[PDB]
């Protein structure tokens, strides 16, 4: 890899600079370089990894959505709208595969604490979810089951090892509920999960400091917003 010659600390430093500059492609390349040093990632570093790739794939998804809609709307268009949509799709799949590769080599393997293991399995579920959004048919089924399996393992650990207000646990539940609604054709599961997650978090807010309270209630608000949209 092209980051092989750069110090791990320098890669992390530059990932933070790239974040400040909203240079998310660079940020992701720096964090990929950091992961490929072979050492575990700290909490802050895990967040940098996620922010980088979530923003990269977010841009790709947004573009894919613009093009997909144009495609579906097409007077004979020629092959160009399809071609360009496929170009973006392929690039998106490439980024997902890169992330999935990092998590499989060897972030998940070496993650023993709940905070890291749940985080990485949530990511695994997320990037399979993004692959699922652009997939068709039988390939879609396997991708969807890969997402489900990762989220489910993360859910099982989070329920055992983390309080109901833990932001990682909450963001996992949020995303798994989105998976149910948008990917798995399971709106009732989505709603049930979001509601139970919200209610169990509400009942644990009393334990929290001002700062932790703010972190937890943000994700709770997102659960509630989704519920309002879905009901």
């Amino acid at each position: 890899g092209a980051m092989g010659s750069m110090e791990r600390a320098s890669l992390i430093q530059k990932a933070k600079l790239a974040e400040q500059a909203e240079r998310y492609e660079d940020m992701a390349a720096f964090m990929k370089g950091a992961v490929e040093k072979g050492e575990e990632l700290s909490c802050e570093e895990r967040n940098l990894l996620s922010v980088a790739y979530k923003n990269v794939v977010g841009g790709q998804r947004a573009a894919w959505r613009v093009l997909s809609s144009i495609e579906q709307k097409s007077e004979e268009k020629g092959p160009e709208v399809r071609e360009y949509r496929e170009k973006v799709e392929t690039e998106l799949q490439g980024v997902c595969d890169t992330v999935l590769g990092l998590l499989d080599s060897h972030l998940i393997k070496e993650a023993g604490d709940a905070e890291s293991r749940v985080f990485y399995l949530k990511m695994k579920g997320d990037y399979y979810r993004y692959l699922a959004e652009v997939a068709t048919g039988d390939d879609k089924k396997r991708i969807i089951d890969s997402a489900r399996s990762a989220y489910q393992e993360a859910m099982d650990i989070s329920k055992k090892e983390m309080p109901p207000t833990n932001p990682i646990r909450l963001g996992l539940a949020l995303n798994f509920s989105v998976f149910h609604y948008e990917i798995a054709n399971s709106p009732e599961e989505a709603i049930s999960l979001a509601k139970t997650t919200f209610d169990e978090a509400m009942a644990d807010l009393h334990t929290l400091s001002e700062d932790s309270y703010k972190d937890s209630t943000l994700i709770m608000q997102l659960l509630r917003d989704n519920l309002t949209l879905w009901t």
Binding site: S69, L222, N226, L229
Partner: peptide, 19 residues
Amino acid sequence: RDKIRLNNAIWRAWYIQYV
């Protein structure tokens, strides 16, 4: 927080409107 909530709502609403 308002911005985060707004951005989330846009993404989620797209799916619903797509159908």
